[PDB]
Design a protein around this nucleic acid. Structure first.
Length: 1289
RNA sequence: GAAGAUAGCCCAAGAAAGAGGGCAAUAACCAGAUAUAGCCUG
């Protein structure tokens, strides 16, 4: 990469912008490059590549013969341009470079012929010598000087397609090279239109001397800009380049013409938009079908553009003639693909030239009056064709159909309009809606650019927006999951009341018959009002932990456990659509005293929980309580805010390698001196040490001052250490985390500097242990104390939560973070915490880079606060949830009425041979039965009662029972038999960690897999994968919802700022009710109110037929209804909300989009299973992202990545399904829909693990066939597939 | 107004076409350890 040293940014000074290069990390005054240094930096990077320049880059008998031919051509005395042109003590280097400059200039100025060296500052005799050096004769001599083989044309064809330098891969250059090589090897060849000197050799010299980049790259950087900038009148519009050259000024004029299109198109009169889309449609028809197409004959034919679009789809015309397939041969298919790409390009050029001529000669009302707008669109069309064939992965007939291309380009043009309105709305929303912020102002104005942005937008500004929008969208996902989890055991929703958060409090009566409760009254959905409080408290660690809590102090009056449920629901709801940017916020309607007291109650258990994790991880089995007490106080006396982009403990200390690592005498030299329970005690020890080291890593090691200094000293390796010294040079106070982040600084996850960081951290940690926790080196196995006896004096020494308690008491916003994170699974809460960390680091990094480049930056987004509250407090709250979500009660009765219902629940996942009687006894019989030899099943029973199984309870609180039952098979006796058999077979080398034999490793892997089954850990895995698939779907929902609002904002902002007719209340609302307010820019205010929880909407009420203002807390659905009643007066439309949305989506499918969004966000899949994950992802791909190609076209890759993260490789096939258009209430029609499926044969395979041994390496499937089967069932259910054929091994 | 994905946009260039650069700006990628043999290898 050319600018690998530097970063680029766009800065905006006084409504003029500049693309800058800057060195990072650097100090202010040493970072941003001035014009000369930018120029020289580019020059220097270009001339870097000069002397390694070779025509050709870089086992089968032929494929290795090609490689040998290339190498001989590239070896010395071969075709080495640096040697050839530097001859005679570099005396001609300047002349040759000047020749290259004039050769390039001759192309742009249409000057025919190679330059003569006489005009490069050189006499006539020398010119003859130089011309000979860069002649075909000399090239032929240099090319064959190292070759003593007989090469064929096919060898030449293969070498060119496989090894030719990318900058030389243009048709005429490749043809020139082929002609030269055929002449060099005395093979008859004719290509009369090609001149070897001009088409190949002269071009090579232009490439060698980088004449294009030297004259263009620096200026192209300087002219970079953002998508939208303010104009003179303080209005945002799409950015237009300042041009400066002949072609650049034409390009700017076309862009200005499209800017005018966007203004004119934003018309509430749908006839204006229809006519403009028809003119754009005619341009597409002209481009692909020529000026004599029947739809271009009558210039005033108001043909339906979508009917024409549908017509070209079923058209069979071929855009190009495809060559016949080959006699696979990957070399021959690459040749054919290159031939096909050149065919597309030739036809594209012809189409372009024909269209340009026709819009010049045969317009007369067919196209746009503005010639520059027709040219803008023709350039978009040409570009769109190139996007398709430059991409080309596989030559296919469907992609060669003219109607495929015309309709791809049509949707591409609509895409471009869509993303520009969205880009406008993004600027308006972020920078021209200040007065959305809560105030006492009785008159506000929306759509005026905030003072700090009138001089324009920088790239750093948009980085800050991305940081905030990412966290907002990530948080939105967790709000949905928290609502799901709270709803899952408290209510049974139905299809008409599927959103838990929109259920109404217990006193809500029907509006039309006040004798009845409203249909959405929460009472109608309660699963069991009598156990409601105890059910809720399962999510607060079990009601047994709350026996001392004065609930009745807070549920006084008629308030009961239904109001308790309603208050928690209200906390969660208050975070939905809660904008981080616009505070509406700190006034929660729920019982803040109750929530605050519950938080304080939970903080009181934290020291007990953390010390209990030492106990439960068996640390007091190997170390003295007093030594562990010292450690406990060190680790937990202060809440620790973790920094992002520090390598995880588990990557620095790989669990599989851990026992060998701690025993290594160069590291720690720990050897535990231990009969029967030997291996089990060894395993307990290494598991205990792993947990203790993990806690030390995060809570003591990473922030230790001495660790940092020693890491820097101890720290390719010269490169690594060089950047470290640069980093600390730039700021000596950078923490170790910040050094790691600066060091660590393709859409598809890849199947089968970081190491230096892991190594230096691993060694620094071992030394930290030796220096500070030396008692760790001397473990001694002894008996576990009673749990209550282990450091019972612990809470006396530390009070980490003292300050946070009072801050949560006084913050509605902290209470939201608390309740939302607290209702997540432990893995989800951990992910939420990680997103917070990533947000904080990103914001810090942006300000850091803005600062070093001297870029003024409005601190609307703070480094230390979010939504008004300290990030450190949010962090501590979420961290409290992470820990407590994973702390399961020891009382079965906290989760089930008795051992019998518990045992019956276990039977959903375990076949303990239920006879038909009592479950508790059938399970007790099963655990007391013999499994293998003298091995009894055991596992699932703890003396008198069934064993409390952590994974079972976690699946009950946070997983989806019917889903898990549908995608897995219950654990069986034979599973438990196999578990014990592999236990035995591995019992003698289990903590070796890194093994000698190959079948030792494979058996260890098999045991690990069986342990995961009998422990229900695979269940947790599948639940997390489903949560990740569902979470990504919800993420996409909030991506779309953001961009729908932005589209509407940008479109109506454009409308407000054009001359089209606008009614009074579109521009200005003068609300004279008791909460009176005047709103200038009313349409913009009302758009944003639809999407912001807490922002009132002004409308004419259905029942009173009078103007009112809402409290702003009603649902998005209610707000859309209210918006309709606001707009309802408008005469120039019938649906203002939907104005322009034909660009964003297919209007006829709007209700299906809403239905899909609701299906996902209301978790309906888990109740009905009427469609699969693949089917939902298919419908998202098909029509959820109509508004922006860049989201739509990554939908399958994102799915593939999620699976690959879990070591599952899937091969997609794209086929056809069905979708409805419209929603019956009866006008829904069915049609074809994209269907993403998986190849029926060998479509799913496991990633391989690389296991190192003593010998060498063995490759083992990460995931066995049984695991892969459940993944396929997860993806396909309710559909069933032949998994034997689909799974590869 | 189906889909056959594995980008998209900005800047530059450009009709005898051009075809370079940039993007934490834009999604993805990378990274992140919550709990006891589950995320190896690089």
């Amino acid at each position: 990469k050319l600018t690998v040293n530097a970063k680029t940014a766009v800065v905006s000074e006084n409504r003029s912008q500049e693309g800058i290069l800057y060195n990072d990390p650097s100090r202010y005054g040493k970072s941003r490059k001035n014009d000369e240094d930018r120029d020289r930096y580019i020059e220097s990077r270009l001339k870097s590549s000069g002397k390694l320049y070779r025509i050709f880059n870089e086992t089968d008998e032929l494929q290795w013969f090609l490689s040998e031919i290339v190498k001989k051509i590239n070896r010395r005395n071969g075709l080495v341009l640096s040697d050839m042109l530097s001859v005679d003590d570099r005396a001609f280097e300047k002349a040759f470079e000047k020749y290259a400059e004039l050769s390039y200039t001759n192309r742009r100025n249409k000057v025919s012929g190679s330059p003569a060296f006489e005009t490069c500052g050189v006499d006539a005799a020398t010119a003859e010598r130089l011309k000979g050096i860069i002649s075909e004769t000399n090239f032929i001599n240099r090319i064959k000087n190292n070759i003593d083989n007989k090469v064929s044309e096919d060898i030449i064809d293969r070498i060119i397609a496989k090894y030719l330098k990318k900058s030389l891969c243009r048709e005429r250059v490749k043809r020139g090279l082929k002609k030269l090589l055929m002449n060099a090897f005395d093979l008859p060849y004719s290509d009369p239109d090609i001149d070897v000197q001009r088409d190949f050799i002269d071009y090579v010299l232009e490439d060698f001397y980088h004449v294009r980049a030297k004259s263009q790259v620096s200026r192209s950087i300087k002219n970079m800009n953002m998508p939208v900038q303010p104009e003179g009148d303080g209005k945002f519009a799409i950015t237009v380049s300042k041009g400066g050259t002949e072609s650049g000024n034409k390009r700017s004029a076309e862009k200005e013409a499209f800017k005018k299109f966007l203004s004119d198109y934003a018309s509430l009169d749908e006839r204006v938009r229809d006519d403009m889309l028809r003119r754009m449609r005619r341009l597409v028809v002209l481009y692909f079908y020529g000026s004599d197409d029947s739809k271009l004959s009558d210039v005033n034919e108001k043909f339906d553009v979508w009917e024409d679009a549908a017509a070209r789809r079923v058209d069979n015309r071929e855009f190009i003639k495809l060559p016949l397939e080959n006699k696979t041969d990957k070399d021959a298919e690459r040749i054919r693909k290159n031939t096909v790409k050149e065919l597309y390009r030739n036809q594209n050029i012809g189409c372009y030239r024909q269209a340009v001529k026709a819009v010049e000669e045969d317009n007369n009302g067919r196209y746009f009056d503005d010639k520059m707008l027709n040219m803008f669109f023709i350039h978009r069309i040409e570009y769109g064709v190139e996007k398709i064939y430059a991409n080309l992965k596989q030559v296919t007939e469907f992609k060669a159909r003219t109607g495929y291309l015309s309709e791809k380009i049509w949707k591409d043009l609509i895409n471009y309009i869509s993303i520009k309105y969205i880009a406008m709305g993004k600027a308006v929303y972020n920078y021209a809606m200040d007065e959305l912020n809560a105030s006492d102002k009785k008159e506000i104005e929306l759509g005026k650019i905030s003072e700090e942005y009138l001089s324009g937008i920088s790239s750093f500004d948009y980085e800050l927006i991305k940081a905030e929008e990412m966290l907002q969208r990530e948080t939105a996902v967790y709000v949905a999951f928290a609502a799901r989890h709270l709803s899952s055991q408290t209510v049974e929703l139905d299809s008409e009341n599927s959103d838990f958060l929109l259920l109404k409090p217990k006193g809500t009566m029907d509006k039309n018959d006040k004798n009845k409760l409203a249909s959405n009254n929460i009472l109608n959905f309660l699963k069991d009002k009598e156990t409601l409080r105890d059910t809720i408290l399962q999510y607060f660690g079990g009601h047994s932990l709350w026996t001392d809590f004065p609930f009745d102090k807070y549920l006084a009056g008629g308030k009961d456990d239904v109001d308790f449920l309603t208050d928690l629901k209200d906390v969660i709801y208050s975070m939905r659509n809660d904008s981080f940017h616009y505070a509406t916020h700190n006034n929660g309607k729920w019982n803040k005293e109750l929530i605050s007291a519950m938080f304080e109650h939970e903080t009181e258990r934290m020291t007990v929980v953390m010390k209990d994790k030492f106990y439960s991880n068996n640390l007091p089995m190997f170390y003295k309580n007093d030594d562990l007490k010292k450690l406990l106080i060190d680790l937990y006396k202060d809440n620790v805010e973790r920094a992002s982009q520090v390598p995880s403990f588990n990557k620095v200390f790989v669990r599989k390698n851990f026992p060998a690592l701690v025993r290594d005498k160069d590291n720690l030299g720990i050897e535990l001196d231990l009969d029967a329970d030997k291996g089990e005690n060894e395993l307990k020890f290494y598991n205990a040490l792993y947990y203790m080291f993990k806690e030390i890593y995060y809570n003591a090691f990473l922030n230790d001052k001495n660790v940092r200094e020693r890491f820097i000293t101890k720290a390719a390796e010269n490169d690594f250490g060089q950047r470290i010294k640069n980093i600390v040079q730039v700021n000596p106070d950078y923490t170790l985390a910040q050094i790691c982040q600066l060091i660590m600084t393709c859409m598809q996850k890849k199947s089968a500097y970081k190491m230096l960081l892991l190594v230096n951290l691993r060694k620094a940690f071992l030394e930290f242990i030796k220096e500070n926790y030396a008692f760790v080196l001397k473990p001694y196995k002894h008996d576990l104390c009673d749990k209550a006896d282990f450091v019972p004096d612990f809470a006396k020494y530390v009070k980490p939560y003292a300050g946070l308690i009072s801050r949560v008491a006084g913050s509605s916003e902290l209470q939201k973070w608390y309740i939302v994170s607290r209702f997540l699974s432990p893995a989800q809460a951990n992910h939420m915490l990680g997103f917070l960390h990533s947000y904080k680091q990103y914001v810090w990094d942006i300000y850091r880079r803005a600062s070093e480049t001297g870029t003024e930056i409005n601190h609307s987004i703070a480094e230390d606060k979010i939504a008004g509250v300290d990030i450190t407090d949010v962090d501590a709250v979420i961290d409290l949830s992470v820990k407590l979500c994973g702390t399961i009660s020891s009382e079965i009765s906290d989760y089930f009425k008795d051992d019998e219902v518990y045992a019956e629940y276990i039977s959903s996942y375990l076949d303990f041979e239920y006879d038909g009687g009592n479950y508790k006894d059938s399970l007790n019989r099963f655990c007391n039965s013999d499994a293998v030899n003298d091995q009894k099943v055991a596992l699932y029973y703890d003396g008198e009662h069934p064993k409390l199984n952590r994974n079972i309870i976690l699946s009950k609180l946070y997983g989806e029972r019917r889903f898990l039952e549908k995608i897995t098979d219950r654990v069986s006796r034979s599973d438990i038999v196999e578990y014990y058999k592999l236990k035995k077979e591995t019992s003698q080398y289990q903590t070796k960690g890194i093994f000698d034999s190959e079948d030792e490793q494979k058996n260890i892997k098999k045991f690990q897999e069986m342990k995961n089954i009998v422990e229900f850990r695979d269940l947790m895995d599948y639940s997390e994968i489903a949560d990740e698939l569902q979470g990504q779907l919800i993420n996409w929902i909030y991506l779309r919802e953001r961009d729908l609002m932005n589209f509407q904002l940008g479109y109506h902002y454009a409308c407000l700022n054009n001359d089209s007719n606008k009614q009074a209340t579109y521009v200005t609302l003068d609300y004279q009710g008791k909460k009176n307010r005047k709103i200038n820019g009313a349409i913009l205010y009302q758009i944003c109110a639809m999407y912001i929880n807490g922002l009132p909407l002004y409308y004419v009420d259905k029942d009173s037929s009078e103007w009112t203002v809402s409290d702003g807390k009603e649902s998005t659905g209610a707000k859309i209804g209210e918006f309709y009643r606001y707009a309802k007066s408008f005469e120039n439309t019938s649906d203002c909300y939907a104005s322009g949305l034909e660009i964003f989506e297919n209007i006829s499918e709007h209700d299906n989009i809403t239905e899909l969004r609701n299906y996902i966000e209301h978790f309906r899949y888990y109740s009905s299973f009427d469609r699969s994950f693949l089917g939902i992802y298919s419908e998202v791909f098909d029509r959820f992202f109509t508004y922006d190609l860049k989201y739509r076209k990554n939908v399958p890759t994102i799915l593939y990545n999620i699976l690959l993260q879990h070591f599952v490789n899937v091969r997609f096939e794209f086929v056809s399904g069905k979708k409805m258009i419209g929603i019956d209430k009866k006008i829904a029609k069915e049609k074809e829909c994209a269907r993403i499926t998986i190849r029926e044969k060998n479509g799913v395979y496991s990633e391989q693990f690389t296991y190192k041994l003593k010998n060498g390496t063995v490759y083992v499937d990460a995931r066995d066939k049984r695991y892969l089967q459940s993944i396929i069932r997860l993806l396909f259910y309710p559909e069933k597939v032949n998994m034997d054929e689909m799974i590869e091994v």
